[PDB]
Amino acid sequence: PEVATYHCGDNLLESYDIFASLPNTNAAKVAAYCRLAAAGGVVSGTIQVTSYAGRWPKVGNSVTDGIKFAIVVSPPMDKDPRSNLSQWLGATVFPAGATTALFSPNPYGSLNTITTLPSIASDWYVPESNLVTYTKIHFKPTGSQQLQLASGELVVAAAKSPVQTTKYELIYLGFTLKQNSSGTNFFDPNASSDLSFLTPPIPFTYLGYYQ
Amino acid sequence: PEVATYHCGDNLLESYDIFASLPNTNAAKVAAYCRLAAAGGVVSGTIQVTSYAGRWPKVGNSVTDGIKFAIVVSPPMDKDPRSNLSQWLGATVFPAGATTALFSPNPYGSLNTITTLPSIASDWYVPESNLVTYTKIHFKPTGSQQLQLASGELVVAAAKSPVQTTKYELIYLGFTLKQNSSGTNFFDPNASSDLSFLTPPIPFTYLGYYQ
Amino acid sequence: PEVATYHCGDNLLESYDIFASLPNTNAAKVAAYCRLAAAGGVVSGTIQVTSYAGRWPKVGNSVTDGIKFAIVVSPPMDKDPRSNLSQWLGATVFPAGATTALFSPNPYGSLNTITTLPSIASDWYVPESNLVTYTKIHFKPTGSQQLQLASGELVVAAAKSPVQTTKYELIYLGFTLKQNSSGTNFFDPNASSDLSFLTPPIPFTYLGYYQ
């Protein structure tokens, strides 16, 4: 197809289905929506993610450490179900029947630049310094006023997991949200459970499959 | 339409028609051209802007403060004329009859991430620290040699104004140009009126409307 | 054409045909691959590059200075052969017969923002500070472990060379790869000749020709 699209998650961002991996063998559920558009072998899209303190583990200091978490967008999960590391409920491809391969990072591009994720499909956070390669986007998230969120960074990395049955590449999306020094600790067990962060749809571009 | 385009402004950058809001209640006229391409609900485009010191307020010091201004791209101005905060002299859509909705920031993504602009249509500058969310783009503009222009940042934020009659989202483009320390002050009342800056066409991507 | 594509180079990154220009009248051969997709007058694409120390100059310090080089993508080389500063073996456009003009930076945009490269076909590196305008993209390359490659910047600038026979605009790609402070010096005369670096496919967006 000339233009193909892919989407997954909840565009209303009220259903907290999506498994995010967090630093130091932690995890949290988020709500997230990803939309991708592939044309000519190049893919641009967006990712948007929200979550609230009630869902988050109570270790570290968010003000000094950042609010850090990752999700995996897994185009080949329709043929490679164990690739679904973030436990998306489903994904939609237009035109119907178009190959999800259009949305995997390019096979030639990914050779020697891909990150192999830790096996445990419930502990695959990879710190930016350990990602093999990435593209970095700068944005500003919003959230509860006492969090004093100032800025964020998204890294976009080609990835695979040994749990997979195919060679199709996945998309690792690592987030770091940064607060001003006056912000409250999102990780404090006494923090209000309803404190939340919410990103805009953050854009990215990558090379996909094509002939 | 599989691919739709939107454009507005003067690609010759000779008509100083466009209203830019500036910090601390100020404003300035600029020349500008925006071109957007929507495919699969994702829009990629460019903005390019130029002005000169004769159009600019003469307060402060550009070397220390930066040269900062904001313009609004308003796709729904065809159905919401009050949304034309930057006073564009129309826009052109291809294919003819395609809806300008395609170019508004997505309503699902914009919910809780949109910035509501100051209500007077002649003073709606928002400092980056007060935008709700944005994507940030890094670039370098050119201009008169003596300004020693070195770099630039563009924030792209979904925005709305209470003056609007429709619920369609706008695009707030906030610019900060940075000079080397030895550059001359753009804001000096005795500086030459012909001193000028000119951005490249700076690219950006965002989530539009789709079915 | 509604969507058009352009590619050049070796997607296997095994053929070191491509001429990269380096600071201080140096040069190095690299293997590289570029893919571009044009829709609506807006072009998105990627560049990916690899090389090894045996091929690089043996003065300076890469840890202090960075690994800096430039590649030119030259869409009009089908009708302006002297424009092929990076000595690509050729390029491929789809649909067949589509003009390579689609992939040249926009002429109205390129006025007064374009960099005029040095007049020498084998010596056209321009430091970031001396580029007229650009957009900057943040990524992370990989390479030999001992280099400790940490990050990279790509600057994308519209360019022309005095050696050209046409007015069709070229794309200057300037790279800076950044190492941690304990990495080995890629330029040390006694560096292992096999030390290498490899970027991901780094995406960029620009305005092309359109009607």
XYZ file of C-alpha atoms in Angstrom:
633
model
C 0.000 0.000 0.000
C 1.068 3.628 -0.646
C 0.259 4.734 2.921
C -0.306 2.133 5.640
C -1.239 2.851 9.261
C -0.843 0.984 12.549
C -2.362 1.771 15.935
C -2.531 0.200 19.334
C -3.721 1.155 22.858
C -6.465 3.383 24.160
C -6.757 6.844 22.629
C -9.049 7.821 25.567
C -6.176 6.857 27.925
C -8.511 5.507 30.682
C -7.639 1.826 30.449
C -4.409 0.923 32.255
C -3.631 -2.251 30.209
C -0.080 -1.576 29.106
C 2.910 -3.119 30.859
C 5.818 -0.689 31.312
C 9.219 -1.893 32.588
C 10.957 0.336 35.126
C 14.556 0.582 36.345
C 15.973 -1.930 38.798
C 13.488 -4.826 38.249
C 10.328 -2.768 38.604
C 7.182 -2.436 36.486
C 3.963 -0.394 36.297
C 0.756 -0.399 34.202
C 0.167 2.639 31.980
C -2.480 3.661 29.460
C -0.944 4.385 26.079
C -1.750 4.989 22.419
C 0.533 4.641 19.489
C -0.218 5.651 15.898
C 2.175 4.996 13.007
C 2.007 5.959 9.335
C 4.320 4.171 6.826
C 4.960 5.661 3.420
C 7.830 4.739 1.069
C 9.546 2.631 3.727
C 9.713 5.529 6.214
C 7.493 5.492 9.275
C 6.404 8.527 11.334
C 4.193 8.374 14.305
C 3.380 9.259 17.800
C 3.285 7.710 21.287
C 1.230 9.074 24.221
C 1.349 7.591 27.683
C -0.244 8.454 31.145
C -0.143 6.807 34.554
C -0.756 7.717 38.255
C 1.067 7.207 41.545
C -1.349 4.433 42.622
C 0.098 2.267 39.844
C 3.754 2.989 40.595
C 6.300 1.239 42.879
C 7.571 3.208 45.939
C 11.350 3.136 45.359
C 13.759 5.974 44.556
C 13.211 9.706 44.294
C 11.463 10.914 41.153
C 12.837 14.481 41.544
C 16.492 13.409 41.516
C 16.107 10.229 39.425
C 13.504 11.152 36.783
C 10.284 9.285 36.154
C 11.761 6.540 33.878
C 9.884 3.713 32.241
C 9.788 1.885 28.918
C 7.249 0.305 26.612
C 7.565 -1.851 23.545
C 5.485 -1.388 20.436
C 5.436 -4.851 18.864
C 4.211 -4.840 15.253
C 4.800 -8.567 14.604
C 2.705 -9.755 17.589
C 0.056 -10.930 15.069
C 2.537 -13.681 13.903
C 4.853 -13.676 16.967
C 2.533 -13.443 20.009
C 5.346 -13.602 22.574
C 6.724 -10.321 21.084
C 3.856 -8.587 22.998
C 6.033 -7.479 25.917
C 3.763 -4.549 26.818
C 0.605 -6.744 26.623
C -1.341 -4.641 24.106
C -4.943 -5.915 23.845
C -4.681 -5.745 20.069
C -3.499 -3.596 17.148
C -5.134 -2.297 13.943
C -3.571 -2.167 10.443
C -4.954 -0.207 7.470
C -5.516 -1.198 4.702
C -6.827 -4.393 6.311
C -4.507 -7.332 5.550
C -1.418 -5.195 4.965
C 1.685 -6.768 6.526
C 2.729 -5.613 10.012
C 6.305 -5.968 8.627
C 5.929 -2.404 7.201
C 6.101 -1.262 10.822
C 9.118 -3.212 12.038
C 12.453 -1.362 12.040
C 14.293 -2.110 8.851
C 16.200 -5.472 8.906
C 19.343 -4.074 7.245
C 19.293 -0.932 9.387
C 18.857 -2.988 12.596
C 21.748 -5.396 11.913
C 24.349 -4.584 14.578
C 22.380 -1.581 15.959
C 19.521 -3.506 17.661
C 19.170 -3.960 21.403
C 18.529 -7.481 22.656
C 16.184 -7.109 25.607
C 16.511 -9.103 28.844
C 14.531 -12.339 28.515
C 12.072 -11.978 31.366
C 9.065 -10.359 29.605
C 8.462 -8.656 32.977
C 11.900 -7.005 33.442
C 13.251 -5.592 30.176
C 14.022 -1.939 31.120
C 17.341 -0.924 29.479
C 19.014 2.292 30.724
C 19.804 4.774 27.908
C 23.522 4.177 28.370
C 23.022 0.465 27.602
C 20.820 0.814 24.524
C 22.893 -0.129 21.464
C 21.556 2.821 19.424
C 18.644 5.259 19.517
C 17.092 8.481 18.275
C 16.256 10.985 21.005
C 13.180 13.301 21.078
C 12.782 16.261 23.463
C 9.311 17.140 24.705
C 7.417 18.445 27.730
C 4.869 16.229 29.515
C 2.116 17.562 31.792
C 0.668 16.194 35.013
C -0.441 17.046 38.531
C 0.698 20.587 39.527
C 2.668 19.514 42.578
C 4.860 17.252 40.342
C 6.295 20.414 38.693
C 7.066 18.473 35.478
C 9.466 20.512 33.333
C 10.570 18.368 30.396
C 11.041 14.840 29.066
C 13.095 12.760 26.652
C 12.010 9.771 24.536
C 14.540 7.326 23.093
C 13.521 5.233 20.178
C 15.514 1.999 19.767
C 15.205 -1.078 17.487
C 14.906 -4.088 19.784
C 14.376 -7.858 19.893
C 13.727 -10.379 22.670
C 14.894 -14.012 22.839
C 11.246 -14.999 23.629
C 10.364 -14.231 19.996
C 9.784 -16.885 17.332
C 10.434 -14.600 14.289
C 13.232 -12.219 13.275
C 10.863 -9.231 13.105
C 12.134 -6.182 15.015
C 10.349 -4.393 17.769
C 10.264 -0.748 18.896
C 11.649 0.098 22.389
C 10.411 3.450 23.682
C 12.268 4.654 26.770
C 10.979 7.700 28.660
C 12.589 10.021 31.202
C 10.370 12.728 32.647
C 12.122 15.475 34.561
C 10.691 17.585 37.361
C 11.817 20.883 38.821
C 13.609 20.667 42.187
C 10.405 21.897 43.897
C 8.398 18.875 42.674
C 7.046 16.178 44.997
C 8.358 12.596 44.917
C 6.015 10.584 42.702
C 7.495 7.438 44.307
C 6.761 8.328 47.900
C 4.399 5.741 49.460
C 2.566 8.643 51.112
C 2.096 10.613 47.867
C -1.499 10.996 46.781
C -2.394 7.975 44.656
C -4.083 10.261 42.116
C -0.942 12.245 41.170
C -0.453 11.626 37.413
C 1.721 12.438 34.406
C 0.538 12.681 30.811
C 2.705 13.064 27.694
C 1.558 14.808 24.461
C 1.613 12.537 21.410
C 5.366 12.552 20.980
C 6.505 12.233 17.328
C 9.219 9.931 15.929
C 10.414 8.671 12.623
C 12.191 5.475 11.686
C 13.133 3.296 8.701
C 10.711 0.322 8.277
C 10.506 -2.691 5.892
C 10.168 -2.148 2.135
C 11.271 -3.590 -1.223
C -7.461 11.973 0.776
C -4.420 9.689 1.011
C -2.016 12.639 1.158
C -3.410 16.148 1.815
C -1.408 19.390 2.000
C -1.954 22.718 3.724
C 0.001 25.924 3.167
C -0.240 29.544 4.352
C 2.007 32.576 4.221
C 4.362 34.044 1.652
C 7.036 31.656 0.407
C 8.904 34.708 -0.948
C 9.126 35.993 2.660
C 8.573 39.572 1.369
C 5.166 40.261 2.849
C 5.418 41.198 6.524
C 1.746 40.326 7.239
C 2.013 37.852 10.089
C 1.336 38.750 13.704
C 3.838 37.283 16.187
C 3.273 37.575 19.872
C 6.269 38.557 21.957
C 7.220 38.364 25.659
C 6.058 41.012 28.195
C 2.899 42.213 26.343
C 4.747 42.983 23.043
C 4.146 41.998 19.377
C 5.879 42.226 16.006
C 5.140 41.728 12.345
C 6.939 38.892 10.539
C 7.019 37.229 7.119
C 6.347 33.456 7.273
C 5.403 30.370 5.317
C 4.037 27.052 6.631
C 3.674 23.838 4.507
C 2.048 20.709 6.012
C 1.556 17.194 4.581
C -0.975 14.846 6.258
C -0.916 11.063 5.521
C -2.439 8.373 7.823
C -3.377 10.883 10.470
C 0.235 11.979 10.984
C 1.299 15.389 9.738
C 4.793 16.527 8.851
C 5.596 20.073 7.855
C 7.861 23.054 8.018
C 7.630 26.613 9.276
C 9.928 29.414 8.097
C 10.038 32.946 9.502
C 11.942 36.205 9.002
C 11.789 39.690 10.454
C 14.004 42.701 11.005
C 14.861 45.133 13.797
C 12.657 47.999 12.513
C 9.625 45.746 13.261
C 10.828 44.784 16.765
C 10.281 46.379 20.221
C 13.394 48.029 21.676
C 13.394 46.620 25.171
C 16.030 44.498 26.865
C 19.006 42.776 25.342
C 18.654 39.986 22.760
C 22.077 38.522 23.581
C 21.117 37.851 27.168
C 17.341 37.350 26.745
C 17.244 35.609 23.375
C 15.031 36.614 20.494
C 11.680 35.102 21.276
C 8.328 35.192 19.547
C 5.447 32.935 18.762
C 3.126 32.395 15.839
C -0.092 30.351 15.652
C -0.955 28.134 12.632
C -4.738 27.891 12.516
C -6.146 25.234 10.188
C -9.784 25.769 11.230
C -9.760 29.518 10.372
C -11.861 28.654 7.304
C -14.753 27.767 9.667
C -13.599 29.729 12.786
C -12.239 33.108 11.619
C -11.434 34.229 15.202
C -8.903 31.356 15.387
C -6.653 33.355 13.047
C -4.508 34.713 15.839
C -1.515 35.294 13.500
C -3.630 37.087 10.852
C -2.728 34.828 7.865
C -4.185 35.999 4.527
C -5.849 32.641 3.913
C -4.584 29.113 3.339
C -4.586 26.562 0.525
C -5.626 22.915 0.858
C -5.021 20.088 -1.604
C -6.987 18.206 -2.753
C -9.623 20.961 -3.061
C -12.450 20.239 -0.632
C -10.325 18.190 1.792
C -11.180 19.201 5.367
C -8.795 21.442 7.331
C -9.576 19.169 10.322
C -6.793 16.881 8.948
C -4.262 19.509 10.075
C -5.643 20.264 13.595
C -3.863 18.528 16.471
C -5.754 15.299 17.329
C -8.652 15.873 19.762
C -7.936 12.718 21.775
C -4.250 13.605 22.107
C -5.002 17.278 22.828
C -7.377 16.555 25.718
C -5.544 17.587 28.944
C -2.347 18.423 26.971
C -3.603 21.548 25.145
C -2.543 25.065 26.086
C -5.297 27.652 26.398
C -3.908 30.923 25.119
C -4.388 34.410 26.675
C -7.767 35.672 25.497
C -6.788 38.940 23.763
C -5.886 38.227 20.092
C -3.028 40.745 20.256
C -1.152 39.333 23.300
C -0.984 35.515 23.583
C 2.738 34.765 23.959
C 3.248 31.851 26.378
C 6.730 31.281 27.929
C 7.893 27.667 27.316
C 7.776 27.077 31.109
C 3.957 27.764 30.968
C 3.091 25.737 27.935
C 1.153 22.644 28.989
C 3.019 20.286 26.639
C 5.210 20.538 23.547
C 7.729 18.861 21.215
C 11.054 20.706 20.993
C 13.069 21.034 17.781
C 16.702 22.225 17.535
C 17.920 24.299 14.608
C 20.145 27.150 13.506
C 18.861 30.331 11.939
C 20.839 32.852 9.934
C 20.689 36.642 9.854
C 22.907 39.681 9.835
C 26.524 38.732 10.521
C 26.862 41.134 13.377
C 24.102 39.382 15.387
C 26.306 36.241 15.660
C 23.192 34.021 15.566
C 24.256 30.547 16.707
C 21.233 28.322 17.340
C 17.487 28.201 17.779
C 14.753 26.200 19.456
C 11.135 25.732 18.347
C 8.414 24.410 20.618
C 5.349 22.925 18.948
C 2.303 22.921 21.176
C -1.396 22.115 20.628
C -3.378 25.255 21.581
C -6.835 26.800 21.782
C -8.181 30.270 22.441
C -11.441 31.197 24.212
C -12.174 33.588 21.248
C -12.783 30.549 19.007
C -16.223 29.480 17.890
C -15.282 25.826 17.141
C -13.553 23.125 19.197
C -10.794 22.626 16.553
C -7.231 22.735 17.800
C -4.491 25.167 16.733
C -0.673 24.910 16.486
C 1.378 27.232 18.746
C 4.924 27.721 17.453
C 7.254 29.245 20.044
C 10.712 30.364 18.868
C 13.902 31.186 20.764
C 16.941 32.357 18.830
C 20.319 32.383 20.540
C 23.282 34.659 19.824
C 26.977 34.272 20.637
C 27.994 36.641 23.464
C 29.796 39.088 21.166
C 26.712 39.583 18.922
C 25.014 42.988 18.694
C 21.756 43.733 20.519
C 18.729 43.285 18.183
C 16.673 45.294 20.710
C 18.976 48.364 20.792
C 16.984 51.511 19.824
C 20.036 52.739 17.882
C 20.873 49.482 16.130
C 20.290 49.443 12.385
C 16.665 48.784 11.404
C 17.915 46.463 8.632
C 19.361 43.854 11.017
C 17.420 40.657 10.357
C 17.011 37.011 11.211
C 15.784 34.183 8.937
C 15.067 30.572 9.936
C 15.423 27.641 7.643
C 12.175 25.788 7.052
C 12.141 24.017 10.397
C 10.503 20.571 10.292
C 7.967 19.181 12.745
C 5.618 16.242 13.068
C 2.356 15.871 15.048
C -0.806 13.756 15.326
C -3.707 15.134 13.269
C -7.371 14.195 12.909
C -8.255 10.794 11.491
C -11.040 8.226 11.179
C 3.796 11.153 -7.824
C 1.800 10.908 -4.587
C 4.638 9.208 -2.671
C 8.132 9.079 -4.231
C 11.247 7.329 -2.883
C 14.980 7.932 -3.288
C 17.795 5.670 -2.163
C 21.547 5.449 -2.548
C 24.412 3.483 -1.016
C 24.919 -0.071 0.230
C 22.235 -1.219 2.709
C 24.597 -4.075 3.694
C 27.150 -1.360 4.701
C 29.980 -3.516 3.321
C 31.157 -1.431 0.361
C 33.322 1.532 1.496
C 32.648 3.632 -1.666
C 31.346 6.789 -0.015
C 33.563 9.892 0.368
C 33.208 11.636 3.704
C 34.853 15.088 4.031
C 36.663 15.751 7.354
C 37.920 18.896 9.162
C 41.356 20.312 8.174
C 41.382 18.959 4.568
C 41.045 15.324 5.531
C 38.784 12.661 4.101
C 37.728 9.082 4.793
C 35.856 6.385 2.989
C 32.700 5.092 4.681
C 29.898 2.659 3.785
C 26.508 4.394 3.928
C 22.880 4.098 2.883
C 20.209 6.770 2.419
C 16.455 6.303 1.982
C 14.084 9.230 1.288
C 10.292 9.314 0.980
C 8.617 12.411 -0.533
C 4.915 13.159 -0.067
C 3.150 16.503 -0.398
C 6.479 18.373 -0.893
C 7.700 17.137 2.512
C 10.545 14.609 2.622
C 11.395 12.217 5.447
C 14.181 9.765 5.423
C 17.216 8.231 7.016
C 21.006 8.102 6.716
C 23.133 5.344 8.260
C 26.985 5.309 8.191
C 29.878 3.080 9.326
C 33.670 3.308 9.169
C 36.806 2.042 10.870
C 39.950 3.601 12.334
C 42.317 2.221 9.681
C 40.628 4.587 7.235
C 40.840 7.755 9.376
C 43.525 10.415 9.999
C 46.089 9.849 12.774
C 46.194 13.304 14.382
C 44.015 14.964 16.985
C 41.963 13.388 19.750
C 38.479 12.027 19.049
C 37.517 11.976 22.735
C 38.249 15.703 23.113
C 37.336 16.760 19.523
C 34.578 14.262 18.677
C 34.479 12.091 15.544
C 33.400 14.715 12.923
C 32.730 14.162 9.133
C 30.178 15.076 6.481
C 28.347 13.268 3.650
C 26.467 14.975 0.851
C 23.274 13.503 -0.552
C 23.001 14.812 -4.107
C 19.589 14.151 -5.695
C 20.349 16.095 -8.972
C 23.454 14.011 -9.848
C 21.426 12.366 -12.656
C 21.589 15.709 -14.518
C 24.438 17.410 -12.522
C 27.063 14.640 -12.228
C 29.658 16.980 -10.621
C 27.217 17.400 -7.759
C 28.079 13.900 -6.493
C 30.525 15.063 -3.927
C 30.242 11.858 -1.859
C 30.889 9.699 -4.945
C 27.767 7.540 -4.587
C 27.773 4.692 -7.207
C 24.290 5.804 -8.240
C 20.776 6.266 -6.845
C 17.324 4.773 -7.322
C 14.058 6.752 -7.664
C 10.533 5.297 -7.551
C 8.285 5.655 -9.501
C 10.706 5.367 -12.423
C 10.747 8.695 -14.260
C 9.846 10.752 -11.203
C 12.028 13.854 -11.046
C 14.943 13.851 -8.560
C 13.896 17.521 -8.001
C 11.347 16.195 -5.409
C 14.292 15.392 -3.113
C 16.179 18.676 -3.519
C 15.681 21.122 -0.687
C 12.894 23.615 -1.583
C 14.122 26.537 -3.739
C 12.156 29.297 -1.953
C 13.143 27.831 1.349
C 16.809 27.515 0.279
C 17.175 31.204 -0.712
C 19.364 33.019 1.850
C 19.554 29.897 4.071
C 21.649 27.591 1.860
C 25.337 26.873 2.567
C 27.731 27.427 -0.234
C 30.309 24.628 0.166
C 34.015 25.111 -0.583
C 34.761 24.923 -4.331
C 36.839 21.732 -4.057
C 35.151 18.393 -4.927
C 37.339 16.559 -2.370
C 37.366 19.168 0.458
C 33.962 20.491 1.660
C 33.608 19.863 5.416
C 32.001 22.892 7.052
C 32.044 23.152 10.905
C 28.556 23.512 12.484
C 29.426 27.075 13.486
C 29.966 27.978 9.785
C 26.813 26.345 8.340
C 24.296 29.004 7.298
C 21.285 27.119 8.746
C 20.405 23.573 9.807
C 18.072 21.298 11.797
C 19.860 19.193 14.487
C 18.977 15.587 15.363
C 20.113 13.758 18.550
C 20.951 10.032 18.388
C 23.278 7.353 19.778
C 25.735 5.449 17.568
C 27.322 2.146 18.402
C 30.866 0.909 17.800
C 33.803 -0.942 19.310
C 33.276 -1.202 23.073
C 36.580 0.499 23.894
C 35.528 3.692 22.079
C 32.663 4.149 24.547
C 30.503 5.926 22.024
C 27.819 7.729 24.037
C 25.893 9.959 21.617
C 25.802 11.778 18.351
C 24.528 14.851 16.575
C 23.446 15.108 12.908
C 23.029 18.540 11.299
C 20.943 18.706 8.128
C 21.635 21.719 5.931
C 20.597 22.719 2.427
C 23.847 23.124 0.347
C 25.223 23.874 -3.158
C 28.732 23.669 -4.538
C 30.434 25.987 -7.038
C 31.380 22.790 -9.024
C 27.711 22.198 -9.925
C 26.301 22.899 -13.371
C 22.672 23.279 -12.157
C 20.874 25.293 -9.422
C 19.426 22.126 -7.851
C 20.015 22.045 -4.040
C 21.977 19.279 -2.275
C 21.662 17.933 1.341
C 24.686 18.389 3.602
C 24.807 15.928 6.486
C 27.278 16.853 9.231
C 28.015 14.279 11.931
C 29.567 14.556 15.314
C 29.971 11.362 17.347
C 30.677 11.790 21.045
C 32.609 9.395 23.369
C 32.765 9.093 27.160
C 35.938 10.635 28.651
C 37.671 7.242 29.203
C 37.128 6.007 25.629
C 40.091 5.238 23.381
C 41.152 7.893 20.858
C 39.895 6.778 17.396
C 42.653 8.947 15.842
C 45.570 7.648 17.907
C 48.211 6.436 15.473
C 48.383 3.112 17.368
C 44.618 2.664 17.731
C 43.534 -0.723 16.560
C 42.811 -0.371 12.786
C 39.600 -2.375 13.241
C 37.926 -0.071 15.779
C 34.671 1.043 14.194
C 31.540 3.115 14.623
C 28.064 2.461 13.265
C 25.092 4.794 13.410
C 21.461 3.655 13.423
C 19.339 4.876 10.484
C 19.098 8.510 11.709
C 15.855 10.150 10.506
C 15.433 13.695 9.271
C 12.690 15.774 7.647
C 12.950 18.665 5.152
C 10.981 20.676 2.629
C 11.493 19.517 -1.021
C 10.293 20.824 -4.387
C 6.585 20.907 -5.152
C 3.905 22.477 -7.360
